[PDB]
Amino acid sequence: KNQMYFDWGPGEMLVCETSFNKKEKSEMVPSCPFIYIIRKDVDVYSQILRKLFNESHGIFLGLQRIDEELTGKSRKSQLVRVSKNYRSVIRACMEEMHQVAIAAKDPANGRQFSSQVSILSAMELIWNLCEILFIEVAPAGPLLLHLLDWVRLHVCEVDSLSADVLGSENPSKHDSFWNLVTILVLQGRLDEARQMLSKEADASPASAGICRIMGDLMRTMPILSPGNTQTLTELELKWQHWHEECERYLQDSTFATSPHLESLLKIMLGDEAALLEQKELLSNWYHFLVTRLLYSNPTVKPIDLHYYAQSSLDLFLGGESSPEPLDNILLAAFEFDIHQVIKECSIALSNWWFVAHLTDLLDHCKLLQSHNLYFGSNMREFLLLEYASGLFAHPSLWQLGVDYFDYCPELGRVSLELHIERIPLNTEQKALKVLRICEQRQMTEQVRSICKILAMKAVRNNRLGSALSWSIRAKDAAFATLVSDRFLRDYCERGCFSDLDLIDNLGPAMMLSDRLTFLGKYREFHRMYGEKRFADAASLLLSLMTSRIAPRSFWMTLLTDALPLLEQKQVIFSAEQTYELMRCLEDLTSRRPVHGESDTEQLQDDDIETTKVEMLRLSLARNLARAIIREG
């Protein structure tokens, strides 16, 4: 026995499960994957899952929750609208599952195709047993069509049995032909039953009229009966009455063939709920129940007497349901127990997205609400959370996981924290995708935390412009103010205020970033000096920054640098700027005696900070004395 170590990695690559062995002459690394139904690395399966999620959440909005309404008030249409929305969602999910199965059937797959077919059959059975008569219980045609579709999608029997039971063999009066005709007439396939009876049949006397009437009744069967008027019910009962009359006339005449024609007439008429003709010419329980419902009453109040016949039929059903994983689920759903099929649908025989969609549909159709169970919320929410937690790998995109986790409750804040803890690098596409996925719901704190983490990670590399947009947007304004103060302190050095050179100058994020135009104006005035316009713009920016806006550390340095460009010891000229400069100098000196400047040519000869203010005041006085007397 060798010590086998299987490191199941999931934090980086979930489709790369490495396994090793701590033994001699065993230095081989074997990379493997997960289950065949939990991985699904194909693009078609991912697209089908995304479409199903968008149809179950994005297309439901308010119809995804169980909303109870009063039936004896003015809001009686709310329940009908909810039922219609649930039926539409179930139909969309069934169509998506059928499309996924048809796409996977052409990709050389056997087990996956069988699992998809079983999931589709289970969904069809659930829709026929639940969302089919909730809004309108008079729709017999739709229920019959759903039952026929479910019986066709269940088992493939019979497919090639017609070519083997009736293959140029004289004659067609044996029990095999009768069994093949009964199996075709029990599943609602009237065309196949009419085609098999017109191939080889001894048309004798007496019973010829009865056989023609039976064929005519089978070809022109009713499949439409509304409850709004009694005419439809009368027309539907007339066919059964005519069939019973024809069967009685065939049984009470000279028809000696009572071992096949009489059985067919009894199965086609109302002689099927007594367990004599329907239970004897059947191979399964669902087919026999469908035949009994099509022959006798077609209501859902007599399903208990049809799903449970005798001991032999129950044993046959139990033996046939041990191979496939859909017959047991259908039998559990038909007996008012749809909660037991979730454990069978959430296995390796039906993947997990289909099971989650079925659970969500059952929870929205007022069939599996809170109670509660053991998770704290419900079964559908727990299944959605489990699917969102499992749908996380290296090749799979994070958008699908973020969309699946937003509709549930778990795998949200912890998942966002785990994703942000390993994303502090030079990657803006992932951050943009996370910000776009977090802004699709009511989670404004996660996006702000992600933006703050991105700004803190970008500030460590000293990348100006890129980090300012992340610190000013979705990060309040303290970080943006600190970045602006740092930029203003770094730009105030020598005469040429460059600082942000090379390729690091950006800032565009709403009014939170457009309000910091003082630094841009100062940079434009320092890089481009256009007569007195640049000086006026710099003076205006300094006056705006010194008015309790852009901090107060670099404001004194900016004022000292601006005062040295006008007049160091002579006169100058300033239009509507000298008064503002004098006011700023008087307000800065009466605060708490705190300033500071740089050093260049004339500033290096001083020592304190009031020298710049005194020089500015002297220059303003000289300008107002030898420039403000210019009268026109």
Binding site: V44, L432, A467, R473, I503
Partner: protein, 316 residues
């Protein structure tokens, strides 16, 4: 929307990318001049107006232009030189950092068709049937697929890393991989015949299997990579050849496409694999368009009549 004259035939228009966690729309956009004796690749920066920030001369017609990052922009010349222009965000000066003159050549000079942008690689294609896969700070290419097809490529879209899908001049879409052996494609999806010629190819942002392409007849074909070998939906639009076609990265329902007739239609399906509303942003009079960019609310495009339409309010 507003137009601006530049006295240059713009052949490409790609907006600059935003930072990580931006709030506003795009303000800067690059352009590429062609069909002249002195092509230049300037970059503008925003009735609306826009001023030129930097300018750099480019040898040959810029057949394709894409921004690899916030300061790097890859361009495909007409002589087979895939140069990476390093734009300065502060000094406003476009410089040439890395270039590959031996990316597309005939052994003559083969013109480079399309060029993908994915950090940190460089996927491009030319008329000689060579699918090179360069990277950043690399002299030689990491992988070069020398296709022996009789047709010539026009566009190349990248679905998953690192398997891209190119379109030839016969209406066929071949999917190749950089880590695969040989020079043959894994899948081949064509249309009806070999008379139609695809010129644009772009995939969806959410679906890695769905991709839209445009032939030489103006019909927008939306095919899949796992649904046979034909198109799932073929709907006509314009009458001339389809120039460029790309969808939005924020919403996958809205998608814009440019043709050679002078109409910038913006389809709005708010699925492409299944009543789509089409609205032309530009009218007649103007000549044909070359490319069109879309970054959320901003929309920039270039025409052949020395015009550049810009609109920062597409949904407002």
């Amino acid at each position: 929307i507003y137009a601006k004259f530049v006295s240059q035939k713009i052949s490409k228009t790609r907006w600059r990318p935003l930072p990580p966690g931006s709030l506003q729309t795009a303000e800067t956009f690059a352009t590429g001049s062609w069909d002249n004796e002195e092509n230049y690749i300037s970059l503008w920066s925003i009735e609306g107006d826009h001023q030129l920030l930097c300018d750099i001369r480019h040898h040959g017609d810029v057949m394709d232009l894409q921004f690899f990052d916030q300061e790097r922009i890859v361009a495909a010349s007409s002589t087979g030189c895939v140069t990476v222009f390093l734009h300065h965000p502060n000094n406003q000066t476009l410089s040439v950092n890395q270039q590959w003159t031996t990316a597309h050549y005939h052994t003559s000079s083969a013109p480079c068709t399309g060029v993908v942008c994915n950090n940190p690689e460089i996927v491009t294609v030319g008329e000689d049937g060579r699918i090179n896969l360069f990277r950043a700070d690399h002299k030689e290419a990491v992988r070069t697929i020398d296709n022996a097809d009789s047709s010539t490529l026009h566009a190349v879209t990248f679905l998953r890393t690192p398997e891209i899908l190119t379109v030839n001049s016969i209406g066929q879409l071949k999917i190749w991989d950089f880590r695969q052996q040989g020079n043959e494609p894994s899948q081949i999806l064509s249309l009806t015949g070999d008379r139609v010629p695809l010129h644009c190819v772009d995939r969806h942002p959410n679906q890695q299997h769905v991709v839209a392409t445009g032939g030489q007849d103006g019909m927008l074909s939306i095919w899949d990579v796992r649904q046979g070998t034909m198109p799932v939906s073929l709907l006509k639009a314009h009458e001339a050849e389809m120039w460029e076609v790309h969808f939005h990265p924020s919403n996958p329902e809205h998608l814009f496409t440019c043709s050679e007739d002078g109409s910038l239609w913006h389809w709005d399906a708010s699925s492409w694999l299944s009543r789509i509303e089409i609205t032309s942003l530009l009218p007649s009079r103007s000549l044909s368009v070359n490319t069109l960019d879309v970054l959320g609310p901003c929309l920039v495009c270039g025409t052949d009549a020395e015009a550049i339409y810009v609109t920062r309010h597409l949904f407002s």
